[model samples]
Target: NFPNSTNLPRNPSMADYEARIFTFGTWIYSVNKEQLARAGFYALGEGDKVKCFHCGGGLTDWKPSEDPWEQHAKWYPGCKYLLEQKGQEYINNIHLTHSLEECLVR
Candidate 1:
């Protein structure tokens, strides 16, 4: 969907795109269901855990204030899909937020 394999569905039913779509029509999590789909995150059909199709990055236990992009970058900085969608500048900023905070704490 991103015009490249950087973010293609990797489930067995990859061709069956609908099968991989998240069905929680009104999920209350901070990560919007629609945005999760666009970012290549597919429900694992067990709890709130989701995995990235292209990068194989998995995340779960989402707090109400947890942002999808920030969590994604923090947990899977190497995800090509994230790099493509969010850009290097955005990713660098996320990393810097943590690094700068840690430095200040020190």
Candidate 2:
């Protein structure tokens, strides 16, 4: 791992390495979440956006433990990550400034 932002990459633990392998190797579900978590790895979320706080792989909408990682891993590769890291934050930040969900198409 590279301490600076120029050499190899950021410091990586087993989770980080494993996440990369799981993603490129095959369906991440192939792996187990409990095992990873116990190992100090966190499964962030689903699809290309996945991040394990332990592994620091994908991003998630919810806290790491709220849901298992593997469950969401296959959900969309990193969707959880998106929701946790970006989606939820996005949704939370989005304000119509007026009540609209009840006024349209319902």
Candidate 3:
């Protein structure tokens, strides 16, 4: 029986949207808490750091123009929850876009 390799949610208790939102108590970050929660991120109560409930991937130092889904795809490409929510096509598009941006910058 498999256990360790199973794609289990990191913060199982924080699975609920309300639970995730509650983690951002008195949020003062530029990124909207609602949007962050929708993107499966729950605030860590540290600066702007937030961790995904599913993959436990943490992200911080967000810019106002940055999007949660895009950042999720950019950083934690192997997250199963992300794949389920956004699909491989969307993930590939984000990767492609980032690659193109890098090429443009170079």
Best by lDDT: 3
TM-score per candidate, in order?
A: 0.71, 0.22, 0.91
> Model 1, stretches more than 4 Å misplaced?
1-30, 102-106
Clashing residue pairs, candidate 3? none
User: What lDDT score belongs to each candidate, Candidate 1 first?
Assistant: 0.70, 0.38, 0.87
On residues 1-106, what C-alpha lDDT tens digit does candidate 3 reach at each position?
Answer: 1111137887799888999999999987788999999998999888999998888888999999999999998988888888888999999999999999999998
Clashes of 1: 0
The true-versus-predicted C-alpha distance at residue 1 of model 3, in Å, is 24
lDDT of 1 at 50: 80
Per-residue alpha-carbon lDDT of model 1 for 6-102, expressed as tens digits? 4453454533335446354446666677667676677776678887766777889877777778877887887777897899899999999978977
Off by over 4 Å in 3: 1-6
Candidate 2 per-residue lDDT, tens place, 23-54, comes to 43333453445554442344434532343442
Q: CA RMSD for every model?
A: 5.0, 12.0, 3.5
**Highest TM-score against the true fold, candidate:** 3
